[PDB]
Design a protein around this ligand. Sequence first.
Ligand code: 9UE
Ligand code: ADP
Ligand code: MG
Lengths: 371, 139, 751
Amino acid sequence: TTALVCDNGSGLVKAGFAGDDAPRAVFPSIVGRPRHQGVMVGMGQKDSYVGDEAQSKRGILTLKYPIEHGIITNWDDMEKIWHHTFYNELRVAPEEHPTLLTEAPLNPKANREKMTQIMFETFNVPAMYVAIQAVLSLYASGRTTGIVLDSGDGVTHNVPIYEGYALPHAIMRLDLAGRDLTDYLMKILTERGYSFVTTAEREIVRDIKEKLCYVALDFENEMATAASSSSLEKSYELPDGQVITIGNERFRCPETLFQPSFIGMESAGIHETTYNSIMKCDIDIRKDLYANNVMSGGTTMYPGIADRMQKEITALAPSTMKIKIIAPPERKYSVWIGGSILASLSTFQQMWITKQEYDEAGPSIVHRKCF
Amino acid sequence: FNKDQLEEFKEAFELFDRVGDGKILYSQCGDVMRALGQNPTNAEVLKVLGNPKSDELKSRRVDFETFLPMLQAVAKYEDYLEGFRVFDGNGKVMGAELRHVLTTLGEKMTEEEVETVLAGHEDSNGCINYEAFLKHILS
Amino acid sequence: ELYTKYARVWIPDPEEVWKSAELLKDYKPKVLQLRLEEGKDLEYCLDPKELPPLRNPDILVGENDLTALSYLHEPAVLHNLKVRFIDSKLIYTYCGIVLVAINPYEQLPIYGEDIINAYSGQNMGDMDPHIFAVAEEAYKQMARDERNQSIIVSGESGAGKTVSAKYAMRYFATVSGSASEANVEEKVLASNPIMESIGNAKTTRNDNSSRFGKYIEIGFDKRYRIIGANMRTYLLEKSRVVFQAEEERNYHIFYQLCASAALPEFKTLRLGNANYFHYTKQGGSPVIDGIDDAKEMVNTRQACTLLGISDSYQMGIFRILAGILHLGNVEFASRDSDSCAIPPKHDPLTIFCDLMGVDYEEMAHWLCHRKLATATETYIKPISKLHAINARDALAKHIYANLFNWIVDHVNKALHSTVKQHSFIGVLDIYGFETFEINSFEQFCINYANEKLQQQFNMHVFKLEQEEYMKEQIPWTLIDFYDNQPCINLIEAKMGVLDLLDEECKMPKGSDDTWAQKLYNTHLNKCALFEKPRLSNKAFIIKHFADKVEYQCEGFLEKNKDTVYEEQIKVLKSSKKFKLLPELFQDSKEHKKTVGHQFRNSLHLLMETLNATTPHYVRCIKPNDFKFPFTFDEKRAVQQLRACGVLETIRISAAGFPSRWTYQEFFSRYRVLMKQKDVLSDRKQTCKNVLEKLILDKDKYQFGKTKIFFRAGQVAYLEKIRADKLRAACIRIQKTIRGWLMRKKYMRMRR
Ligand SMILES: C/C1=C\[C@H](C)C[C@H](C)OC(=O)C[C@H](c2ccc(O)cc2)NC(=O)[C@@H](Cc2c(Br)[nH]c3ccccc23)N(C)C(=O)[C@H](C)NC(=O)[C@@H](C)C1
Ligand SMILES: Nc1ncnc2c1ncn2[C@@H]1O[C@H](COP(=O)(O)OP(=O)(O)O)[C@@H](O)[C@H]1O
Ligand SMILES: [Mg+2]
């Protein structure tokens, strides 16, 4: 039978069957509960809402994410999201389909233990695996050498890989995110005198970010030009048809990814953590990790981020050794595409954790097999 | 062999001497043995002759005294009947089949020899009473 | 032992694969002393271990059943065909149930009506072998029992399959009473040159090798009289459309079409000389010796017109083939490392558009880019030149396979007749086993298909003989199946060669080197039938039923890739200019499936079509390489007999009880051994004493109720001891008569 392939971050869940080329079900990983007194009788009140309901209803609701930074923070909502995914959205009984689950590297180990334990106990899935989100992007990009820069909501990490070997001593992990880009965008918009205080408002600001941000080819030139001209300034409509102008702040928000000092991290941007990750590994390898840079996950999709890095590293790195940046349009789904590829290899079928080997060994076996 | 036997055999041997030297050829040895009552095969004849080569078989001459040990060596019924019953079960044998086996297997004889010995022994069907033919040729 | 002086043995020679000799000496447990027609007296030499194959006695040689022979081995099967074919000129022969047919090049008289009528009453043993005995047994089974009947014909394409089918069709037409009702025969034989033209290609071993299975149903009314016919086709060599090894050609119809370019009709096609195009050029060898391409054309088209194809459909088909040829010449220039483009005003695509109707711009864009659709949104993604090439070649293969299935189904429209069919007899022509100095994906698929047919053949023979032992009340456990699941599980099953090849197609940066290097872990030590050639890492060896066969990987990955992008066929399907192109692609994963997986499905349908049925077999062996009206050349015939599984049917049956005798004929010769002391009232009881006394080991034979079953070799043993007892009697009589006639010469001489 086809395996299921499932990817969940703190943003969208992505799910589908292995061997398919695009995910069948995509919905925000949100669980929502009603915040107002139900007044109507026979309203049909519902214990909780999941994904697209929690979007549509949202104004009546309050909206909560069960994952902070790849770490599942409360399990009962995660279990609800999986239940909604398999029964309602895929509509396929999980007893019959091996399942593939995806995670950021250097997570708390218990997260893998519990994520396994729920699959075997609560869905009786016949077999399971876990993969690193960064590894699966190379399959989607068609390479066995490169440094996978991957950033969605939640975690941002670099994993270098050379000829199918990963290099644990060079893995980098950070907590800039589409989320802390959103919360910074909310904070800074207050200077234009617009305010958003609620989760459902945050889900507005996220659409403002998704439509209107772009990454400055040079920061200080456009910081001058926005002082110089209205021509940069772009306007947008709230759900109710009130309309707002936004300024330099639309480029200025993803500038934080290059300078985390703005949010108030002392860290260096994804460019310098890319460079330091390369520098952490052997000079024999390094030219190949300059030759392939693979961008994954949604936050990479800000227009012009690729050109900004291709400038920034070329300025940083040794002058003659050429740099290239590889940023396939699919990349928002590349981690799922990679899991589709991986779960349909015939060599891989050996390597699913079986129910037997769990039942002997308890959840801990996952630490032996998966990584 | 006693003196009388040796005398009869020597006389017969000398009758086969076509050169007057008191000798026969090796190739005549079998013929002399047969005239004297032996029935050796060509293989047996050549063996008692010492497997002679063609040239000495046809031209080397031996007197009676050298021939004699060979005659001795060669000298030293129900099977015969079953052997004829092989080619039958009404007690007959095709003349064509007997001719074929005598002219094509074993130590092949000539067709004229077979015609000569078979003359008058086959009936109108071309069948030979083999018990009678055998008794006749053993008499 | 069986060896004794004045015994005969087969000795190897280069000039013909064996030579007959006689022993001058007894053997003993070394050297043997041998008699030969030339250099008549020789040392022979004994391997430090075997003996030379002992030779069958001359009562058995020349019989109609090759398994009636007592010693079964390559020499005897060579000899017994040789004798009839040159000396008798009797060509049909039986091996077990399988019918061996040796191609004459002279047309023999024997096929005429009078013999057909004479066969029509007579069962499988009642006659000498002939094609009508198979066609009759099939017709009798169908009439005697509902179950549909198959005939299966195997060999190299030039071994006369078509003629062996054609006469079987005459047999059905003539016997069925059905001549008035329909001509299938005229239609089948007028259809043949079309499917030869599109179906066949030169293969380096011979011209006009058919690359596909061709299957024909002949349908009957419930009154067992012919309605009509239906074709099917299987196992087409989809890979050959775009790639050839050296000294091979693409399918004939491309060369025929290019040679026809002189004609005004095809002017618009702008076809160049046949080696201008990239699909035709690669074999290097654009002319088949001995044929006029353009003159084959006029018969091809006459066969189409006679088979009810539109005069304008013919130009449609040629317009499409010309489309494929123009398509191949498209050449991609890379924009970047990871993206590529078609250059401005590129000629062949400009012509391919004016042939097919589709816009230049949308083709040129879609060839350069894949489309991906998520549920909500869509991404036009660029693709590397090395991907774009395999896309174009996949589209070329997909067009050709559809055009072939359309031409076959229009053939069927002519052949098919509207009475509802009660049942059918089906006649199948397929390539036999195939091995060349180099072997490649085409041969790996051919050999897999062969060995899967061979499994059904084995199981069917094992059923028929477990019947024959059951009827005659032997214990049937005495004989055991012979099974090549251990090899099919290597080719077919998961973690098998085809599966690791599909995996290496999709895995990133896959290559032939990493495919072989991934095979050698899993199989090489673990599996008894997979073996590595010692001096190389680009190659692997598989033992089939027939032989060991070495496959080069070098080409082997590229040929497996198929994927066809949905946009690129959707563009064609939309095309305005003429009917047929939309007609081809009429009603997925089918675009994703690899060539080896499409073939693995096609063969599995062929197997379901045969396993519905109780087959009959014909094997065709081409007895000399040069088309001589009659010659027999043993070095060729060996290779045929191995490639057509006859030698394996024999090697299997030699472990059986192949040699099988009536109690009356057993008296008929062997009363000579039987002492008339013992010769007794009851035949079934009499021999039980004699045989168990002559043969001291009881395991070597069995008493069937109505027949006796000997192991191989002990019939000729009984014949030897009979010949000895006959010789002993011949001695005793010749001894007597020699002595008598010498005494009478002495009477003549004295008196
Ligand atoms: C007071 C401290 C720790 C905690 C409050 C002490 C408690 C006791 O630790 C837990 O066990 C709780 C929990 C946790 C959650 C789930 C789980 O299955 C196990 C543990 N883990 C967390 O809250 C992590 C989550 C995390 C961030 Br984001 N990135 C990370 C990168 C790698 C690993 C984990 C993380 N977290 C926010 C922190 O550590 C913060 C930054 N730590 C501190 O300020 C220092 C001064 C120590
Ligand atoms: N087209 C886009 N442009 C800019 N940001 C986007 C775009 N699409 C999604 N995002 C942001 O990226 C994050 C989602 O990233 P993603 O990798 O899909 O999450 P996950 O890691 O859960 O799959 C969210 O913060 C979302 O607002
Ligand atoms: Mg992600």
